[PDB]
Design an enzyme around this catalytic site. Structure first.
Site, PDB file in Angstrom:
ATOM      1  N   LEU A 170       0.827  -1.186   0.000  1.00  0.00           N
ATOM      2  CA  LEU A 170       0.000   0.000   0.000  1.00  0.00           C
ATOM      3  C   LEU A 170       0.865   1.239   0.000  1.00  0.00           C
ATOM      4  O   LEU A 170       0.472   2.288  -0.521  1.00  0.00           O
ATOM      5  CB  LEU A 170      -0.891   0.031   1.228  1.00  0.00           C
ATOM      6  CG  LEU A 170      -1.978  -1.015   1.300  1.00  0.00           C
ATOM      7  CD1 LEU A 170      -2.596  -0.984   2.667  1.00  0.00           C
ATOM      8  CD2 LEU A 170      -3.011  -0.735   0.245  1.00  0.00           C
ATOM      9  N   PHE A 230       9.396   5.573   5.645  1.00  0.00           N
ATOM     10  CA  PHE A 230      10.046   4.995   6.818  1.00  0.00           C
ATOM     11  C   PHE A 230       9.551   3.538   7.026  1.00  0.00           C
ATOM     12  O   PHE A 230       9.623   2.987   8.138  1.00  0.00           O
ATOM     13  CB  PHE A 230       9.777   5.889   8.054  1.00  0.00           C
ATOM     14  CG  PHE A 230       9.757   7.401   7.752  1.00  0.00           C
ATOM     15  CD1 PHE A 230      10.943   8.096   7.419  1.00  0.00           C
ATOM     16  CD2 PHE A 230       8.551   8.130   7.818  1.00  0.00           C
ATOM     17  CE1 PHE A 230      10.926   9.491   7.143  1.00  0.00           C
ATOM     18  CE2 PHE A 230       8.526   9.525   7.551  1.00  0.00           C
ATOM     19  CZ  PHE A 230       9.716  10.202   7.213  1.00  0.00           C
ATOM     20  N   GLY A 231       9.053   2.927   5.944  1.00  0.00           N
ATOM     21  CA  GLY A 231       8.599   1.527   5.949  1.00  0.00           C
ATOM     22  C   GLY A 231       7.424   1.212   5.022  1.00  0.00           C
ATOM     23  O   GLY A 231       6.735   2.130   4.534  1.00  0.00           O
ATOM     24  N   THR A 232       7.214  -0.091   4.784  1.00  0.00           N
ATOM     25  CA  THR A 232       6.053  -0.620   4.062  1.00  0.00           C
ATOM     26  C   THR A 232       4.802  -0.608   4.928  1.00  0.00           C
ATOM     27  O   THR A 232       4.895  -0.659   6.148  1.00  0.00           O
ATOM     28  CB  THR A 232       6.244  -2.096   3.682  1.00  0.00           C
ATOM     29  OG1 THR A 232       7.634  -2.396   3.619  1.00  0.00           O
ATOM     30  CG2 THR A 232       5.592  -2.407   2.351  1.00  0.00           C
ATOM     31  N   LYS A 254       1.776  -2.212   9.138  1.00  0.00           N
ATOM     32  CA  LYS A 254       2.934  -1.353   9.012  1.00  0.00           C
ATOM     33  C   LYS A 254       4.121  -2.116   9.515  1.00  0.00           C
ATOM     34  O   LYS A 254       4.232  -2.405  10.698  1.00  0.00           O
ATOM     35  CB  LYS A 254       2.781  -0.041   9.787  1.00  0.00           C
ATOM     36  CG  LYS A 254       4.073   0.750   9.887  1.00  0.00           C
ATOM     37  CD  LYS A 254       3.852   2.206   9.659  1.00  0.00           C
ATOM     38  CE  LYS A 254       3.224   2.829  10.851  1.00  0.00           C
ATOM     39  NZ  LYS A 254       3.012   4.276  10.629  1.00  0.00           N
ATOM     40  N   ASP A 278       0.464  15.836  15.243  1.00  0.00           N
ATOM     41  CA  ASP A 278       0.508  15.570  13.823  1.00  0.00           C
ATOM     42  C   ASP A 278      -0.838  15.260  13.217  1.00  0.00           C
ATOM     43  O   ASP A 278      -0.963  14.385  12.343  1.00  0.00           O
ATOM     44  CB  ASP A 278       1.475  14.454  13.509  1.00  0.00           C
ATOM     45  CG  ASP A 278       2.158  14.678  12.202  1.00  0.00           C
ATOM     46  OD1 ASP A 278       2.101  15.836  11.686  1.00  0.00           O
ATOM     47  OD2 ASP A 278       2.731  13.703  11.668  1.00  0.00           O
TER      48      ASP A 278
HETATM   49  C1  LIG Z   1      -5.881   1.396   1.817  1.00  0.00           C
HETATM   50  O1  LIG Z   1      -5.241   2.575   2.329  1.00  0.00           O
HETATM   51  C2  LIG Z   1      -4.727   2.496   3.605  1.00  0.00           C
HETATM   52  C3  LIG Z   1      -5.409   1.862   4.646  1.00  0.00           C
HETATM   53  C4  LIG Z   1      -4.861   1.804   5.925  1.00  0.00           C
HETATM   54  N1  LIG Z   1      -5.514   1.188   6.923  1.00  0.00           N
HETATM   55  C5  LIG Z   1      -5.030   1.122   8.155  1.00  0.00           C
HETATM   56  N2  LIG Z   1      -3.865   1.660   8.442  1.00  0.00           N
HETATM   57  C6  LIG Z   1      -3.147   2.288   7.491  1.00  0.00           C
HETATM   58  N3  LIG Z   1      -1.986   2.837   7.816  1.00  0.00           N
HETATM   59  C7  LIG Z   1      -1.430   2.664   9.014  1.00  0.00           C
HETATM   60  C8  LIG Z   1      -1.040   3.753   9.792  1.00  0.00           C
HETATM   61  C9  LIG Z   1      -0.440   3.541  11.039  1.00  0.00           C
HETATM   62  C10 LIG Z   1      -0.224   2.240  11.500  1.00  0.00           C
HETATM   63  F1  LIG Z   1       0.355   2.004  12.696  1.00  0.00           F
HETATM   64  C11 LIG Z   1      -0.609   1.166  10.710  1.00  0.00           C
HETATM   65 CL1  LIG Z   1      -0.357  -0.445  11.246  1.00  0.00          CL
HETATM   66  C12 LIG Z   1      -1.206   1.372   9.478  1.00  0.00           C
HETATM   67  C13 LIG Z   1      -3.631   2.376   6.187  1.00  0.00           C
HETATM   68  C14 LIG Z   1      -2.945   3.015   5.160  1.00  0.00           C
HETATM   69  C15 LIG Z   1      -3.492   3.084   3.869  1.00  0.00           C
HETATM   70  O2  LIG Z   1      -2.840   3.696   2.824  1.00  0.00           O
HETATM   71  C16 LIG Z   1      -2.136   4.946   3.143  1.00  0.00           C
HETATM   72  C17 LIG Z   1      -2.072   5.979   1.994  1.00  0.00           C
HETATM   73  C18 LIG Z   1      -0.819   5.733   1.140  1.00  0.00           C
HETATM   74  N4  LIG Z   1      -0.566   6.827   0.180  1.00  0.00           N
HETATM   75  C19 LIG Z   1      -0.647   6.211  -1.185  1.00  0.00           C
HETATM   76  C20 LIG Z   1       0.044   7.065  -2.263  1.00  0.00           C
HETATM   77  O3  LIG Z   1       1.416   7.337  -1.821  1.00  0.00           O
HETATM   78  C21 LIG Z   1       1.473   8.129  -0.590  1.00  0.00           C
HETATM   79  C22 LIG Z   1       0.730   7.461   0.585  1.00  0.00           C
END
Ligand SMILES: COc1cc2ncnc(Nc3ccc(F)c(Cl)c3)c2cc1OCCCN1CCOCC1
Length: 303
Positions: free
Chosen positions: A23, A28-30, A50, A142
């Site tokens: 995603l 700073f990580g996948t 994450k 933030d």
């Molecule tokens: C389907 O979209 C998401 C669902 C998510 N659902 C839950 N958590 C997300 N992020 C997240 C944030 C904090 C955490 F500790 C963990 Cl484990 C996960 C998520 C991040 C997600 O994607 C983030 C958006 C990514 N953009 C995509 C384009 O390039 C820049 C960043």
């Protein structure tokens, strides 16, 4: 004084779930999409995961565990809670999947289907989220459209605790910061309120960039002359006012998240009186495998 934080931290076996697609990498990580079977329960749970930079230096494991600590410690319909973690080699944070992604990305990409009802609602829901965190004596540091995610179009949750604090202890998104923040590293809940205001502005301006172009080392300067962000073209004075109230110098003159809930809530009762959007009332705003046993995490609770 301060109560015993009895949150249960769940340790998940690496066998308990499949990864399924990236995603977000770089940074700073996948973060992956994924499914989770809390083994011995026979229920699938769409999740995000994450995982920290494969370069698993000790300088980093600390920061992601910090998140985990906080994410594990909250519980509100508008605050991303931690499902559990996983200990492979790099620590994996497993939270609930926010399928529609982050709010910033969303409003930018759906500019044209976003009605006042929606905008005004997210305002309420974020004020709600943030007020809770205040109750749990927490500072976020933030609040930003990029850090609010979307369960459904009418369900946003606050996330990203990589920066949080208990209020008054010790341990840079400059354009989202209160003044006492930039010049004095001071952080009250009332500083979170400033980022709230900014976050509202992001939304009302369909994902514009605050102080666009304007280089950051200058923000302390501009702000100090008494200059704030412009009324967004859709904002009645009443909305715009409430934004400007978060940007007062004297920070107790900012409003509280609790009042923020009330005003916005009031407003979301008669949305077209408060935002003026073109052709508003005519707007309205993912699988594989089984899905028989799929349940959303908000309906998965152990005591
Ligand atoms: C389907 O979209 C998401 C669902 C998510 N659902 C839950 N958590 C997300 N992020 C997240 C944030 C904090 C955490 F500790 C963990 Cl484990 C996960 C998520 C991040 C997600 O994607 C983030 C958006 C990514 N953009 C995509 C384009 O390039 C820049 C960043």
């Amino acid at each position: 004084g301060e109560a015993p934080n009895q949150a249960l931290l769940r340790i998940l076996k690496e066998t308990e779930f499949k990864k399924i697609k990236v995603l977000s990498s770089g940074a700073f990580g996948t973060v992956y999409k994924g499914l989770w079977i809390p083994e011995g329960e026979k229920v699938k749970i769409p999740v995000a995961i994450k995982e920290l930079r494969e370069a698993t230096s000790p300088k980093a494991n600390k920061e992601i565990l910090d998140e985990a600590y906080v994410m594990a410690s909250v519980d509100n319909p508008h605050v991303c809670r931690l499902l559990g973690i996983c200990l492979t080699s790099t620590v994996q944070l497993i939270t609930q999947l926010m399928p529609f992604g982050c709010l910033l990305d969303y409003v930018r990409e759906h500019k044209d289907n976003i009605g006042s009802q929606y905008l005004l609602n997210w305002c309420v829901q974020i004020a709600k989220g943030m007020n809770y965190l205040e109750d749990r004596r927490l500072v976020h540091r933030d609040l930003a459209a990029r850090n609010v995610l979307v369960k459904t179009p009418q369900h946003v949750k606050i996330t990203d605790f990589g920066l949080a604090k208990l209020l008054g202890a010790e341990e840079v998104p400059i354009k989202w910061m209160a003044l006492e923040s930039i010049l004095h590293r001071i952080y009250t809940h009332q500083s979170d309120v400033w980022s709230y205001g900014v976050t509202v502005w992001e939304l009302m301006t369909f994902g514009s960039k605050p102080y666009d172009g304007i280089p950051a080392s200058e923000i302390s300067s501009i702000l100090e002359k008494g200059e704030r962000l412009p009324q967004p073209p859709i904002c009645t004075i009443d909305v715009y006012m409430i934004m400007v109230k978060c940007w007062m110098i004297d920070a107790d003159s900012r409003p509280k998240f609790r009042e923020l809930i009330i005003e916005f809530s009031k407003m979301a009762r008669d949305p077209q009186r408060y935002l003026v959007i073109q052709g508003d009332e005519r707007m309205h705003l993912m699988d594989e495998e089984d899905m028989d046993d799929v349940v959303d995490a908000d309906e998965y609770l152990i005591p």
